[PDB]
Amino acid sequence: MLVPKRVKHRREFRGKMRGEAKGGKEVAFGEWGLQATESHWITNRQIEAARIAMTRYMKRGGKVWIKIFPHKSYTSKAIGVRMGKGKGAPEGWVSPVKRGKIMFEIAGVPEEVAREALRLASHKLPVKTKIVKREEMGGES
Amino acid sequence: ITKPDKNKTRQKRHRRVRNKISGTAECPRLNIFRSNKNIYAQVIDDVAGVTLASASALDKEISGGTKTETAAAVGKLVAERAAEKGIKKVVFDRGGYLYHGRVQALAEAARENGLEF
Amino acid sequence: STSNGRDSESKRLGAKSADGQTVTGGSILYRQRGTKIYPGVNVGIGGDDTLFAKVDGVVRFERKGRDKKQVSVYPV
Amino acid sequence: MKQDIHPNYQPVVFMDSTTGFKFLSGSTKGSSETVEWEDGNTYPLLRVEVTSDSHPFYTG
Amino acid sequence: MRVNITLECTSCKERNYLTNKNKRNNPDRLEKQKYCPRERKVTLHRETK
Amino acid sequence: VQLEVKERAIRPRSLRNQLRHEGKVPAIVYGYQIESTPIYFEEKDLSKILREHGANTVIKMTVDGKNINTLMSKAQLDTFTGQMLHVEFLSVNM
Amino acid sequence: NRLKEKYIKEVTPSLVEKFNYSSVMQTPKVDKIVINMGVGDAVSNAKNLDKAVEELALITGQKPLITKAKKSIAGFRLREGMPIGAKVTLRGERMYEFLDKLVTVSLPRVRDFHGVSKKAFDGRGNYTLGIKEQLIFPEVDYDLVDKVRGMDIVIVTTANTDEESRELLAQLGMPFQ
RNA sequence: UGUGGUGGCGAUAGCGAGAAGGAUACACCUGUUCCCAUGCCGAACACAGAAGUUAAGCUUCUUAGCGCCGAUUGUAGUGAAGGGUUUCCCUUUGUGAGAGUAGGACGUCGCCACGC
RNA sequence: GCGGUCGCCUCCUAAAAGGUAACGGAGGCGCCCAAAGGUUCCCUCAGAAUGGUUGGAAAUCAUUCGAAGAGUGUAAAGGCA
RNA sequence: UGAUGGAGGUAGAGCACUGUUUGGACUAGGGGCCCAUCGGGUUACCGAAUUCAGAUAAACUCCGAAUGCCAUUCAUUUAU
Ligand SMILES: [Zn+2]
């Protein structure tokens, strides 16, 4: 149970949510980034697999931009228990992402290792991605 | 230290009394206005906001002092100019004060000179 | 079980007479808790922030500059 | 000035070893001796002889 | 601590009013100036004995 | 100098869903002397203005007339493709 | 008394000759002296407050207030409403008589004789000198004083700079070191 | 015409920053014997005055720095009508956002007295 | 069946009038005040900056900045400078 | 149905308070090791204070839709 990122509570349970679509919320700091094209949950461990697939084949530096935390609690029942009684134990820290967001921004290293490690993290996410720079820019920094 | 101003609190207490009671439809306001060397008193109305009658400090009859004497003179002039228009049931103001010192001097001179309260 | 299973009864607030109407002697207008609307002409406030129409007239709502609202009754 | 609450003091003459700095007040009282016009017509007995040059920060 | 108490009108002798006190504060007999319907004047009312 | 100026209605209605599937640009223009209209553009010419000078060019509106020197204010765009919508202008002139 | 008349004679024209006003209604004044005596041991006994109020009433012709807690600190053992300190103010000659007392009697009878510590500035000239001793003043009985406390005194003027407060109190005695 | 006094109108009235002012007004400043006052305190609070000075308050004027109010519109979202997978997305059709605005904006209107 | 629950009150689910169930998601009640009531007057907090013996992270202060960041006998909402 | 004024915090926006949490600049000089039996706190956090950019709400709000609901000596058409 390798959960990286948690919350200080002030609630325990949350409703099982609903997701339709989002917009905007583009490249801020890195020189390269993803775009999700789906709408699902993203649990704890997938971002740690993203960490490792970033950091190993990003050899010797190059900055990372983790941008998305889990916030919401899952639950789950107990096995062998009928339908009926209250919500089970909080087992999961899961935050959803819809199409158009950016999981990670990347700068500091030329494009080869960038597209490498971005492919290397994308296999350990259930989301088809794209690969975006600061492609369309209203200012030349 | 800045000196806090004084007329601000006086007009605050005006606001509290008017927001308690003005109600001046046919029973207008009496008016109690201080300065250093002067007493101003008017009769101001609602809804239109037009005065009815006043009594000047140092433009008219006699003096007096920081006393009842100017104030009784003002009360006489105000009650007589109210009797000119045939008005007997005015509602007071209070300035920003209690009824002690340049107040009941005006008040009872307005009372027993022929104005019902 | 869980510790839930604890609710009250719906005490049925909300306005019970809209604008442009005519009112009997002293009936309810918009039953509040907490002053959300300050009174106006011919309006009474009871012991439970309920609102009155004394003179039989026309209920209308107003501003208070920017801040909050005023019931207003006007006779014929 | 609220009645019946004040302590006791008068313009007490302050004697000195030099020149008689006799021009102030004091709470404690005593025998009324230097009832004088240029000074208090009160007690002198507070007779602090520090001349303000007894520790002459002003003079040396 | 608090007991259901009735005021006694010491004039007409009728168990007229009713109120509540806290007997940790007041070990006395409660005496106020209240009204009576049978007598129509403000009357000293005591605690029932 | 040689550009595309179309015109629109006050409310073109919920035909606006169609468009986006055609290749249209619905947007805002409000300016300095001439206040404010709706005006279409196309996508494959703004990117050719991006290679003319860059991202801070000089815009001259052509109905074979004089110019509205707009100096583009915002562009935040679509998910899932990343292309042109909501092209706000501002004619901060000479 | 005296220092009013020094303002008449020499101080206020020197303040004009330095600061170059457009009226004497532009001039800084001296108004308040605020005095504080807390105990803290009045958790145990307020008889320190008793004789402290006795000492203060023998200093000037007042009796102070009895200032309560306005907090609740278990570290100091405080609830609300626990009386702590006492407040004396000064006006009139009791300004100037106490000023000349500080010139003449008390302050040149304080051990480790150096003068007056300077840095009480507050930016806007608010010199508070937490006094070491209680036995300084000639009104003090050695046979009554039981602690080795001193005095909290707030002095408030209308001096607008620390330079103005320096020049005024230097022209009212106060040997800054 | 200026001041003072008392009125409404969403601060477009406001905050800042700066410049000028005392005929009168107002306000500070003189003192408390007198009414009254302090959980100490003529600082306020009430009084008895009129020495000074425009210093501050206050009045006029500037200023889009702060703050407020903002069209045109794009788009999300959404009623009615439809279709594929039903997680959702798309389309006919009315109706529109919040943002980011361009700009306005350092007031308008009421009554009386006095100086006039 | 064993467990747990059975009356009342504040929120959310509750689909922007009301209303609307679940062994749904939350908290409290079975009192208290002789003034914590009524009237009439007077006052403005939370904080933050600096100087200041006992005095320290803060006891009492003083000066300024400061729109609620406090309080409102008791649960929660809604109010109230 | 059309016209008219009204009840209000669902949809999206959802930052201003209550919240969650990201990276950049500053820090109060704190916690040391101390160089100590005052030049540096070099160096480790610079955290609180701030402070810039970017997000997140069923028990968040600076704001705020259609649509339904309530009314009208209203207008049309029909039978309630
Ligand atoms: Zn009786």
Cα G58 from chain centre:
15
Q: Which of F56, F59, F80 to mutate to test the interface with A (most CBs of A within 10 A)?
A: F80
Instruction: Verify if strand J has an atom below 7 Å from the CB of A71.
Output: yes
The closest CB to that of A138, out of F75, F80, F82, belongs to F75
Is-contact A30 A106, C-beta < 8 A?
yes
Angstrom distance (rounded) from CA F4 to CA F37? 15
Q: Which chain G residues are closer than 8 Å to B1 by Cβ?
A: 31, 156, 158
Give the tokens for residue D50.
Answer: 């520090």
Annotated binding site of E for Zn(2+): 9, 11-12, 36, 39, 43
Rounded to whole angstroms, the Cα distance separating B37 from C63 reads: 43
Other Cβ atoms less than 10 A from the Cβ of G130: the count is: 11
- Residue with structure tokens 């006799």? D22
**What distance in Å separates residue C4's CA from the closest CA in chain A?**
9
How is chain A classified by DSSP, letter by letter? ---------S------------------S-SEEE---S-B---SHHHHHHHHHHHSSS-S--EEEE-----EEP-B--TT--S-S---B---EE--B-TT--SEEEESS-HHHHHHHHHHHHTTSSS---EEES-S-SS--
**Do residues A118 and A131 touch, judged by C-beta distance below 8 A?**
yes
CA A105 to CA A34: how far, in whole Å? 7
Cβ of C27 near strand J (distance < 7 A) = no
Residue B113 falls within a domain, yes or no?
yes
What's the gap in Å between A1 CA and the centre of ligand 1? Answer: 82
Q: Is C4 on the interface with A (CB under 8 A)?
A: yes
Backbone angles phi, psi at A97, to 5 degrees: -140, 135
**G165 exposed, middle or buried (CB, 10 Å; 0-12, 13-18, 19+)?**
buried
Residue B13, in any domain of the structure: no
> Residue E24's domain spans which residues?
1-49
Q: How many CB atoms lie within 10 A of CB G79?
A: 11
Q: Which CATH class is domain C14-74?
A: mainly beta
Alpha helix positions (H), B62-103: 68-85
The two structure tokens encoding residue D7: 């302590």
Q: Is residue B50 part of a domain?
A: yes
Strand H atom within 7 Å of B35 CB: yes
- Residue B43 · residue B82 · CB < 8 Å: yes
User: CA nearest G97 in D: which residue?
Assistant: D24
At B100 the three-state DSSP class reads coil
Residue G103 phi, psi dihedral angles, 5° rounding: -70, -50
Rg of chain G over all Cα atoms, to the nearest angstrom:
18
Which three-class secondary structure state does DSSP give residue G74?
Answer: coil
Q: Which helix (H) or strand (E) holds C44?
A: none
| Residue extents of the structural domains in chain C | 14-74
* Cβ proximity of A132 and A41 under 8 Å: no
Q: For residue D4, report the phi and psi dihedrals to the nearest 5 degrees.
A: 70, 15
Q: Are the CB atoms for G42 and G55 separated by under 8 Å?
A: no
> Distance between CA atoms of B41 and C15, rounded to whole angstroms?
46
Residues in chain E: 49
Q: CA nearest A124: which of A61, A56, A51, A62?
A: A51
The H-or-E segment that residue F17 falls in is none
B82 φ, ψ (degrees, to nearest 5): -80, -35
b/e per residue G53-75 (b: at least 16 CB within 10 A): bebbbbbbbbbbeeeeeeeeeee
Domains in chain B, number = 1
List the single residue in A with minimal CA-CA distance to C3.
Answer: A86
**Distance, CA of G14 to CA of G9 (rounded, Å):** 9
Cα separation, F64 vs C69, whole angstroms: 55
Chain centroid to Cα D5, Å, comes to 23
Distance in angstroms (rounded) separating the CA atoms of residues D10 and C65: 62
Could you tell me which residues come within 8 angstroms of residue A22 by beta carbon, excluding any fewer than 6 positions away? A98, A99, A100, A101, F79
Find all residues with CB under 8 Å of G74, minimum gap 6, and list them. Answer: none
Structural contact between residues B106 and B33, judged by C-beta atoms closer than 8 angstroms = no
Q: List all chains that touch chain G, counting a touch as 3 or more CB pairs closer than 8 Å.
A: B, D
* Number of Cβ atoms within 10 Å of the Cβ of F45: 12
Structural tokens at position B37: 């060397």
* Cα-based torsion angle of the residue sequence A3, A9, A15, A18 in order, rounded to the nearest 10 degrees: -60
State how far the Cα of A123 lies from the Cα of A106, in Å rounded to an integer: 17
How many contiguous H segments (helices) and E segments (strands) does chain G have?
Answer: 5, 3
